[PDB]
Amino acid sequence: CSGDTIFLFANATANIYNWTGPNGFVSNLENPFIANSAALNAGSYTVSITDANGCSNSGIVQVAVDERPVTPTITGNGPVCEGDNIQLNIGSYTGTTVQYTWSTPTGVVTTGVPSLNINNTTVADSGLYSVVVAVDGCTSLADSINIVVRPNPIAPNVPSNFSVCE
Amino acid sequence: CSGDTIFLFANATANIYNWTGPNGFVSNLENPFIANSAALNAGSYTVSITDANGCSNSGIVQVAVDERPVTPTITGNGPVCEGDNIQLNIGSYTGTTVQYTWSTPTGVVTTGVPSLNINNTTVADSGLYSVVVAVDGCTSLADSINIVVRPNPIAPNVPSNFSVCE
């Protein structure tokens, strides 16, 4: 996935190695690597091997660079009451397959929708929530939000039943 | 990291040096350099050496240029009271690994989240806050914000217990 280091392997011995790739990549190493990988290095890499007797052969490796989704920002609905509902929102992600994985104070849930909805909120839902988004195999760094849900106040004291005279 | 000077090294003697690189980079120096480095100079650089007897050899160095995150702007929540909470926000950064390092009047804290939250604020929290963001090894220049937190007022004088006649 993009940003990490591409490790290429010849999977063969040689006295001399010659690699050629998409952006003028050149190497004479066995199993060389490319730092800070980005999409412009995706493509066909050629391995050319020369042996001890001066004879040679070759082969091709197709190297993909997967796109890394950007960390989402969780948008909440502010502090809530026990008698309330919690909604968290994420900006949409696209791809062949998108999974939103959420960690909540009560467990882990998943969805195909960039949102989370807790109805009939309770104080047990107080705590940190976080979301990590996986798009076609690349996992974003998760975001975290603090959701505060407090209990409903107790009915106030009112003077007990009484009577007055006209 | 981008914007600084690339220093290349041949790590070998020669009578004649010949360097070739990604954007038509050409040099005849031992250990040449590229000023104001930017991503379009990342790539494979070739070193070609000719010795005293007229014979030659070569080698390849893979040069990365890391992306420099932009200095964040710290957004605060305005002046606060002792009986209050401080929240600072940063725009999100992405990468393989992102660390937000914060300096506060009471010490240094870190997080993986572009935010800072001080609950139960006290006057000891008055002062400058600053944040530096490190993304995959490149460190941004830090921003600084002045957060002002003042003590709660003292209960006012009210006349002492007294009595009046109907």
- Check B98 against A71: CB less than 8 A apart: yes
CA distances from B15 to B10, B20, B26, B53 (A): 12, 17, 17, 10
Q: How many CB pairs under 8 A join A and B?
A: 52
H helix runs in A26-152, sequence order? none
- Residue B22 backbone zone (phi > 0: left; psi -120 to 50: alpha; other: beta): alpha
Best mutation site among B94, B98, B111 for testing chain A: the one with the most A CBs within 10 Å?
A: B94
Radius of gyration of chain A (CA): 29
- Check A144 against B112: CB less than 8 A apart: yes
In chain A, residues with a C-beta closer than 8 Å to the C-beta of B120 are none
The full DSSP string for chain B is -TTS-EE----S--SEEEEEETTTEEE-SSS-EESS--GGG-EEEEEEEE-TTS-EEEEEEEE--PPPPPPP--B----EESSS-EEEE-----SS-EEEEEEETTEEEEESSSEEEESS--GGG-EEEEEEEEETTEEPPPEEEEE-EEPPPPPPP-PPS-----
Give resolution, Å, one decimal. Answer: 3.8
Residue type, B19: W
Radius of gyration of chain B (CA): 29
Q: Tell me if A107 sits within 8 A of A116, measured CB to CB.
A: no
- Check A141 against B46: CB less than 8 A apart: no
Please name the residue of chain B whose CA is at the shortest distance from the CA of residue A71.
B94
Q: Whole-angstrom Cα distance, residue A17 to residue A86?
A: 60
Handedness of CA A1, B101, B123, B88 (dihedral sign): negative
Comparing CB atoms, the residue among B59, B92, B95 nearest residue A73 is B92
Q: Tell me if A77 sits within 8 A of A146, measured CB to CB.
A: no
Range list of β-strands (E), chain A: 6-7, 16-21, 25-27, 33-34, 43-50, 56-63, 80-81, 86-89, 98-104, 107-111, 115-118, 127-135, 138-139, 143-147, 149-150
- Check B42 against A27: CB less than 8 A apart: no
Non-local (6+) Cβ contacts of A149 within 8 A are A79, A80, A81, A82, A84, A86, A121, A122, A123, A125, A126
Measured torsion, CA atoms of residues B109, B113, B119, B124, in degrees rounded to the nearest 10: 30
Task: Kindly state the tokens that stand for A15.
Answer: 């006295």
Q: Whole-angstrom Cα distance, residue B66 to residue A31?
A: 22
In chain A, residues with a C-beta closer than 8 Å to the C-beta of B92 are 70-71, 73, 143
> What's A106's DSSP letter?
T
Q: Please name the residue that has the structure tokens 């010659």.
A: A18
> What's A79's DSSP letter?
-
In chain A, residues with a C-beta closer than 8 Å to the C-beta of B42 are 36
Method for this entry: cryo-EM
Residue type, B11: N
Handedness of CA A126, A127, A131, A132 (dihedral sign): negative
Task: Kindly state the tokens that stand for A121.
Answer: 């909120």
Q: Whole-angstrom Cα distance, residue A60 to residue B34?
A: 33
Q: Tell me if A52 sits within 8 A of A15, measured CB to CB.
A: yes
Task: Kindly state the tokens that stand for B49.
Answer: 């050496």
- Check B43 against A36: CB less than 8 A apart: no
Quick one: B155 exposed, middle or buried, by C-beta within 10 A (0-12, 13-18, 19+)?
Answer: exposed
Q: Whole-angstrom Cα distance, residue B108 to residue A127?
A: 24
Q: Tell me if B136 sits within 8 A of B96, measured CB to CB.
A: yes
Q: Tell me if B33 sits within 8 A of B10, measured CB to CB.
A: no
Q: Whole-angstrom Cα distance, residue A15 to residue A21?
A: 20
Other C-beta atoms lying within 10 Å of the C-beta of residue A5? 11
Question: Which of A89, A132, A11, A140 is closest to B93 using CA atoms?
Answer: A140
